[PDB]
Design a protein around this ligand. Structure first.
Ligand SMILES: N[C@H](C(=O)N1Cc2ccccc2C1)[C@H]1CC[C@H](N2CCCC2)CC1
Ligand SMILES: N[C@H](C(=O)N1Cc2ccccc2C1)[C@H]1CC[C@H](N2CCCC2)CC1
Lengths: 823, 824
């Protein structure tokens, strides 16, 4: 009747102006806290950070003062580090390597997106333009009051120098990756030295060193393949643990180059579900320097026995690094089903020089002490899957050798991620490293002396995707981030790692916080917001008696950032299996109760993402507000398989992706229809990108009477065509889950898609190297065979995401027109 | 105006599917073998390729032509017993599938074959191997089908372009891995003759026509058997010769097109010369081999021109054609410069070729050795201000020395393709083949003794795309096809090459004929049809006294083939510049005068094609009849630039592609509006594929108030992305025609496209290796930048043309829906 609200129909030009009007920069992040060391001065700290003032991301600093009036709020000035410097390459065009890493990192912003910092010398090291640059501030060099030009580091290399890092033991040196091999150089003398020789004169050249391969980067959130030893030994020797990789047996596929006029593709090693991942191993590279800084010698070392024989079950190296004294290297290992993890200590003496000579090799093997061996200090096991959590803090071995104390984030134990203090017993069995042997199961398993829960409950410690802990050893406290208060807000917490009792929250409720702690534990920064309020960045001092450190009171010190949008509203309901799901609704603008409005169910719905939480959405999800301003109801549901709710909630997806997610979405939709008076269930569109697109198609397949149209972007339509890392973890290998692979692949159910045109819009970025355009291509193929209608939009200069603003606007205008006309 | 406007009934998608499904629910490549039995009842056996209607694929067949008749319908007899020539699920090798595209070959099975008349030996490609069978001559005529014999090989990969050695049928040749091979069919012995091949580090090949030669110059071979054997050496060895083209693609651009193995997610590399970019480096080489009495291949030799091809013929960019004289005294080549405005017919004496050696010293000796009188002879040179179309007619007569008499099809002389008899004088200047040689502007240009026009007038002899002449030397008559009667019909004519007087037509008017003439000139076949009648295939016997062979009467001997569709109507009109253009209309079925109907202007409009002529359109253009049955008027105009109207008609395109054609189309549309009163000019849609998609986009760009919607398929949107052969011929090099490349490139005029959605539907095959998907991908890129709506349909398992019926049906269903919903 007249109850049905009708969206105003605009011309295309009209829609373009509306979208253009709606859209007519990244808050400080990546901080370094530095104490001044000057009682006379008016500043206690200098805070260094990356940020973008109201053009490009750049290195910046603020001065933290010694006293504030406290009658008024103090706003800190963003001072430029560099004087009129452009870090973005000309026309924002990066090399294939640098552009692919921005993709893997989901980096949109231009300029300096990472940097290294050496505290003692005040040395900053970073990629800029298509080269390497550096500058010095603080420490022995002293604190500038105005910007200084960064100095380009000269190289006789060709191609980009990737993943640069300062030597922690000696800031005269630094490392980088050039043409799939490891290099080192001395900033002070300009001397360059290559340490690995896996690359030659690229189906022909399949070996690399120091490099994280595609799946490692896309599916394991590791972007480096090497790790500086934190100390030197005495000439003086320096060390680098590194992953050596061989992709020969890995499948090659071709994706189109951004240079469209060239009409060429790029080749990738793409391990599709069910076939070979690269062959990998951990190696060690040494090099000696004299007192003048000259690189005297270098050496390539390998495990005394093959890595494949020592660790037969290991499929991926998730993480690596060293103990703080440089005693032991360490590596986090994973099996192919991703159900068994191992933290392993590799003592350096375990590694011997590589040589072609079998005699020399046996001499080096005989020489290795019998008491040197791998130590498997930890092992996590599960029936679902092992999420890679990044927390692992080895304490120095003060209580002598033969034991190792560390903190560890474990989720498999109780089903949620919590902190544990662990003491593993290192007891050398004694080995004949000269004779080869095949180690069995639990061959290097350390007995666990003790294992204490530091945190517990129906909630999780944040330990993935940049989340970290801060451990103060004087006070025996561990600072961390979590959902203890609620799954919709991230908060900062402190708890004793000595006496695991009271967890104390340091962040204010109502808001979700992104925090950085000073290494001196005297102050932290919180970048936070709510659904109703734009984000701010405040500086908090921890004040109180030094005899009660757990109860330091965080006191607001200063602010670094502050602030036709209508915020959405968070709600919750329970499913017909009594599971609590959260949701979000954008109500139509100028709502008139009694009207039923057309509705857009905006969806993602896969693992590792939570859309519904209490933080500001107006930046990333402006289009959803735009839809609301035209008078659409917009509904977002976080169904089972979504994250921040523990393994068992996420685990509802196991081996049946596509099957569980829509029900929760349909439940949520029906709930919203009762609660809020304003949903017309006769006019409901489903729409998402990536996992969201896959689900938009499943929604139309399985629930055609509920969803009138689907707008599906960048979808995965054939699970056999997706990679190993992601697919096998949640769906098993295809040989072991034909039912799920088939039931979850939308391209194989195309008969179930509609006979009515205008109900399915497909969208996909032609350059997509993650969800290959093949997915859309194969779906149309099958749509054609089944005699089904479709509409299609291509983004020819876009990969998985749309990043060019004009393409984005076109995307939003198209979406508005499709809905206007056909919903 | 409400009642007047006819409204197409709007169907559901499934309804449209049933309509397309309901709607969709000949002999060629002949050999006339004379049967030499007086008592028998059959004068000849006629061998040919054909698809029986019951049969799934093309196959080698035969009919028996009887001695006397009393309406005879001849049986199609199977040559091969229950043989599948199509490989599994019609899946050819990349090499054979790309050659099928280049040849525009739709049908499955045996698409070509070689035949040696004396031995009665047939040689052809089948499965993914080579097959052969024997019939007639010394073998004898079979009465029942015979299983074909496979030819075993040590080679790996496909054996392409098989040809029987004319001088000795025991031998045959083929291309394996970009090199020329020969083999003795009787002994099964194989022998490789070139070594250009050993991916992108292997750019040399031999005996092979490269992409552009194939796609743009209608040559599918790069080797040519010498037709006569030789008998020179120490002790009784027999020498056989093959002329061939060596090619070096090094400096030619590489592009990647996706593989038909979609699930592989890979591409193929292609040497694709874009306009203005480098073509392969070329030369002509000679390969000889010697055989003993037992048919063993004793030796082989790689030979080459005593002087570089690039110094002897410095202006030559493309080898259009080549071959040998019938006595094997000279090899010949047709050459073309890069602008394709200068052609040369050149005779290459075999003695002009010396064995190839890396040794500097040996080459000098062999060069010195070459006789001083030996040289190339440029017997013909053709020049023009427009472009040289390549004409296949060149018939050298046997010599009876010091001159060469030949027939030539020439278009540049008068502006129309006509037959000429030419006598060129061969007089040797004398050259030191040892010294370096740099030639003058007319170094080997033979004087022309005489040059006679055998045909003349405002009409053309057919000399391209399979058209050819037949020359009977006893009677002095040349037989050919032409548009002399009218440009809408192909007819068979006979004129004397001895005495150029009366041209006699042998085909019946009212139809367009495709004819094959017997080598004995006693019998001929015509495959013909009209706009209103489906094709037929009749056998005609030439009769009359031998006193006046020019005046032999064709007499119907027998038929090989006989016979809601409503044919279209041909019409003609005159432009405001007083040019006569032909058109075609399909009237809406069950038309009610006074109604105004929505109209589809179906277009192509590019050179080398003519849509409007008097022949059956029902097979190829069924969809246009389906449109008419729904109530659309469908119009087709042959505007300036189209073919079979001579060079100057075609020449109006020159360096302004996209600029002239639409005017002729619009004139044509408005004309049809006045004559027939059933066209609603407020509802006109433009649609075509290939050149027609390019024009559909130009129609909407330049005439947005004339065309409400455009449906463009496989279009070229940026001329810079297109190849050298086609583009440079009609549009010059990009550095010499920046205005025209820019005005003719639809992707650069995207601002001019509409602001209203549902006015433009773009279609393109993902696997297109001719008009790369890039073109559409680039237009979408530009559309997005300009903020312009578009719809788009991809054919993922399809190159330039849609061949999977499942996809074809979907394409039509999509078209009807687009028209129904958005044409208003
Ligand atoms: N490899 C995955 C991917 O990009 N996918 C695309 C896609 C599209 C359709 C169906 C499934 C998939 C999986 C990504 C793994 C990391 C995850 N991040 C979110 C916040 C931090 C970690 C996002 C997904
Ligand atoms: N290479 C050309 C082609 O395929 N083109 C596609 C296309 C699309 C848009 C704009 C221009 C072009 C040119 C074809 C050359 C051979 C010719 N044949 C017709 C009958 C016998 C010869 C047809 C054209």
């Amino acid at each position: 009747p007249a109850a049905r609200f009708q969206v105003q129909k605009h011309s295309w030009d009209g829609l373009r102006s509306i979208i253009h009007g709606s859209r007519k920069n990244k808050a400080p992040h990546d901080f370094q806290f530095v104490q001044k060391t000057d009682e006379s001065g008016p500043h206690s700290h200098r805070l260094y950070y990356l940020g973008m003032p109201y053009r490009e991301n750049s290195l910046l600093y603020s001065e933290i003062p010694k006293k504030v009036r406290k009658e008024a709020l103090l706003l800190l000035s963003w001072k430029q580090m560099l004087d009129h410097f452009q870090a973005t390459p000309h026309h924002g065009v990066y090399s294939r390597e640098e552009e692919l890493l921005r993709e893997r990192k989901r980096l949109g912003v231009f300029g300096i997106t990472s940097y290294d910092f050496h505290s003692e010398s005040g040395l900053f090291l970073f990629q800029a333009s298509n080269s390497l640059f550096h500058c010095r501030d603080g420490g022995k060099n002293g604190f500038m009051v105005s910007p200084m030009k960064p100095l380009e580091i000269k190289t006789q290399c060709s191609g980009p120098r990737m993943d640069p890092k300062i030597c922690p033991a000696d800031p005269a040196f630094f490392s980088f990756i050039n043409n799939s091999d490891l290099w080192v150089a001395n900033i002070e003398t300009g001397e360059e030295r290559r340490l690995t020789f896996c690359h030659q004169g690229v189906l022909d050249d399949p070996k690399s060193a120091g490099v994280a391969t595609f799946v490692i980067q896309e599916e394991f959130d590791r972007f480096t393949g090497y790790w500086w030893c934190p100390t030197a030994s005495w000439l003086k020797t320096l060390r680098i643990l590194y992953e050596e990789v061989d992709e020969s047996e890995v499948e090659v596929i071709h994706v189109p180059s951004p240079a469209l006029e060239e009409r060429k593709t790029d080749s990738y090693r793409y391990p599709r579900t069910g076939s070979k991942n690269p062959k990998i191993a951990l190696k060690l590279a040494e090099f000696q320097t004299d007192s003048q800084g000259k690189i005297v010698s270098t050496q390539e070392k390998e495990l005394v026995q093959p890595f494949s024989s020592l660790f037969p079950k290991v499929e991926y190296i998730a993480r690596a690094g060293w103990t703080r004294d440089g005693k032991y290297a360490w590596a986090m290992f994973l099996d192919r089903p991703q159900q068994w993890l191992q933290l392993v200590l590799l003592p350096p003496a375990l590694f011997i020089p590589s040589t072609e000579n079998e005699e020399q090799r046996l001499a080096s093997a005989r020489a290795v002490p019998r008491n040197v061996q791998p130590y498997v200090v930890y092992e996590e096991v599960t029936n679902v899957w092992i999420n890679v959590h990044d927390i692992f803090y080895p304490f120095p071995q003060s209580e002598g050798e033969d034991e190792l104390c560390f903190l560890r984030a474990n989720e498999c134990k109780t089903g949620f991620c919590h902190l544990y203090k662990v003491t593993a017993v290192l007891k050398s069995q004694g080995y004949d490293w000269s004779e080869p042997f095949s180690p069995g199961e639990d061959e290097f398993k350390c007995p666990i002396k003790e294992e204490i829960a530091l945190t517990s409950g129906e909630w999780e410690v944040l330990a993935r995707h940049g989340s970290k802990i801060w451990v103060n050893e004087e006070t025996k406290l561990v600072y961390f981030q979590g959902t203890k208060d609620t799954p919709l807000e991230h908060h900062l917490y402190v708890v004793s790692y000595e006496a695991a009792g009271e967890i104390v929250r340091l962040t204010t409720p109502g808001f979700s916080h992104s925090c950085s702690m000073s290494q001196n534990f005297d102050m932290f920064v919180s970048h936070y917001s709510s659904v109703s309020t734009p984000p701010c960045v405040h500086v908090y001092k921890l004040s109180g008696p030094d005899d009660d450190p757990l109860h330091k009171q965080p006191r607001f010190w200063a602010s670094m950032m502050e602030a036709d949008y209508v915020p959405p509203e968070i709600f919750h309901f329970h499913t017909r299996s009594d599971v609590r799901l959260y949701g979000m609704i954008y109500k139509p603008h100028a709502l008139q109760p009694g009207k039923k409005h057309p509705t857009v169910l905006f969806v993602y719905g896969g693992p590792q993402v939570q859309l519904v939480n209490n933080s500001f959405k107006g930046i990333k999800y402006l289009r959803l507000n735009t839809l609301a301003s035209l008078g659409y109801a917009v509904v977002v549901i976080d169904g089972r398989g979504s994250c921040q709710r523990g393994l068992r909630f996420e685990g509802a997806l196991k081996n049946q992706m596509g099957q569980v997610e829509i029900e929760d979405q349909v439940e949520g939709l029906q709930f919203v229809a009762e609660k809020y008076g304003f949903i017309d269930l006769s006019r409901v569109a489903i729409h998402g990108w990536s996992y969201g697109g896959f689900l938009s198609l499943m929604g139309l397949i399985h629930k055609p009477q509920v969803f009138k149209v689907a707008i599906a972007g960048a979808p995965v339509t054939v699970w056999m065509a997706y990679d190993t890392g992601y697919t096998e973890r949640y769906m098993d290998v295809p040989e072991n889950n034909q039912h799920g692979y088939e039931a979850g692949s939308v391209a194989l159910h195309v008969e179930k898609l509609p006979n009515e045109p205008n109900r399915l819009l497909i969208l996909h970025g032609f350059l997509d190297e993650n969800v290959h355009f093949f997915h859309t291509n194969f779906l149309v193929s099958q749509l054609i065979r089944a005699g089904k209608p479709y509409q299609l939009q291509i983004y020819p200069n876009e990969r998985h995401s749309i990043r060019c603003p004009e393409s984005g606007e076109h995307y939003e205008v198209t979406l508005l027109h499709f809905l206007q006309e056909y919903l």
